[PDB]
Design a protein around this ligand. Structure first.
Ligand SMILES: CN(Cc1cnc2nc(N)nc(N)c2n1)c1ccc(C(=O)N[C@H](CCC(=O)O)C(=O)O)cc1
Ligand SMILES: CN(Cc1cnc2nc(N)nc(N)c2n1)c1ccc(C(=O)N[C@H](CCC(=O)O)C(=O)O)cc1
Ligand SMILES: [Ca+2]
Ligand SMILES: [Cl-]
Ligand SMILES: [Cl-]
Lengths: 159, 159
C-alpha cells in the first residue's frame, strides 16, 4: 500500500519559504521509526532541504528534472516512482504538498504529527475527509526540554 | 578568562525549561566552533535539554542537587566551577539564566546570537552595559531552507 507521513502545524500547514520554526526531535524519531527499511518517495525540494539520503531507506525523488545526486533514484511519474519501489508491502510518501496531492487518492494510510504551531504557511497538506479515515492511534505530548511545541501522533486508515 | 555564549531572541529572552521555537543549525555550528576543546559551565535545565555530555568539552554542571550522570563534573558553586576548569585560556559559560547572572561580572567576552524570534518568556539574558562592552564582530544572516530564522553573530569585549 501507499502511506503518507506528514507533520502539520495549525491549518494543515506543512511548509514555509524557510525552515519550520520548531525543534521537534521526537517527531524526527517518530518519522524514522515509521519509514526505516521502506522506500521513501519525496519531491525535489524536500530532497534539497534534507541535503542527504535518509539512511537505510530507498530514496526516490520525483521531479521532471535531470537528477543531481547519484546516491538516489530520480523518477518523473507517480507510476514510475511506484515501479521503482518494486515488491514492498508499504511505500512511504514523505512530501511535499504536490507529492501528497498526487498520492493521496492512492494512499491507504496516514501517519500524522499534529503540531500546535500557529504559523503562516506556503504549503498545506490537502484536505482529506474525517469520515473516509479511521483514527487507529493517537498520542499527545507536551513540549519539553528537547521539543519546542506540543504535538500529537496519529495514524488513520481508509474506511 | 570567562566568556558567556548565548542565543537571544527579541527582548533578550532566553530559554527557560522547554526548547526554543526555532531551528537554527548554523547557531549550533557556531556554538560548537566556539566551545570545542574548552571547558563548558551550565546549569541543570540546559543539561536536560542537551541530553548528554558535549563531545570534546569538559562538562561542568552547576546545580545544588545531586549529580545524575557521571560522565560530567557537578558543582555546587561558581568558585568551584572555576577550579574544575583548572587554568585554561577560556572557559565558556553556556547558560542558562541564573548561570549567566552569577558570571557576567567576571566576564570579559560575550558571543551573542541575536535571533529575530519573538518568544514569550520569563527569563532574559542579563542586562549588558553598553559603555562597558564593546562590539568587535557582527555578522547578519538570512533564514534559509535549514535555518528557520534570520540571525546575527556578535562578540563583545568588556572594556
Ligand atoms: C525536511 N525533512 C522532511 C520531514 C521532516 N519531518 C517530518 N515529520 C513527519 N511526521 N513527516 C514527514 N513527512 C517529515 N518530513 C527531514 C529532515 C531531517 C531528517 C533526519 O535527518 N532525521 C531523522 C533522524 C533524526 C536525526 O538524526 O536528527 C531521519 O532519519 O529521518 C528527515 C527528514
Ligand atoms: C540545548 N543546547 C544548549 C544551547 C543551545 N544553543 C546554544 N547556542 C548558543 N549560541 N549558546 C548557548 N549557550 C547555547 N546553548 C545545545 C543542544 C545541542 C548541542 C549539540 O547537540 N551539539 C553541538 C553541535 C550541533 C550538532 O552536534 O549537531 C555541539 O556543541 O557539539 C549543543 C547545545
Ligand atoms: Ca479505535
Ligand atoms: Cl519537494
Ligand atoms: Cl538549571
Amino acid at each position: 500500500m501507499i502511506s503518507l507521513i506528514a507533520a502539520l502545524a495549525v491549518d494543515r500547514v506543512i511548509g514555509m519559504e524557510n525552515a519550520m520554526p520548531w525543534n521537534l526531535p521526537a517527531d524526527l524519531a517518530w518519522f524514522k521509526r515509521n519509514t526505516l527499511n521502506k522506500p521513501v518517495i519525496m519531491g525535489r525540494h524536500t530532497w534539497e532541504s534534507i541535503g542527504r539520503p535518509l539512511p537505510g531507506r530507498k530514496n526516490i525523488i520525483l521531479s521532471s528534472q535531470p537528477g543531481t545526486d547519484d546516491r538516489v533514484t530520480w523518477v518523473k511519474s507517480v507510476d514510475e516512482a511506484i515501479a521503482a519501489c518494486g515488491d514492498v508491502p508499504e511505500i512511504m510518501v514523505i512530501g511535499g504538498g504536490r507529492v501528497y496531492e498526487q498520492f493521496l487518492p492512492k494512499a491507504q494510510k496516514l501517519y500524522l504529527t499534529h503540531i500546535d504551531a500557529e504559523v503562516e504557511g506556503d504549503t498545506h497538506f490537502p484536505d482529506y475527509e474525517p469520515d473516509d479515515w479511521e483514527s487507529v492511534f493517537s498520542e499527545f505530548h507536551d513540549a519539553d526540554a528537547q521539543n519546542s511545541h506540543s504535538y500529537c501522533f496519529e495514524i488513520l486508515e481508509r474506511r
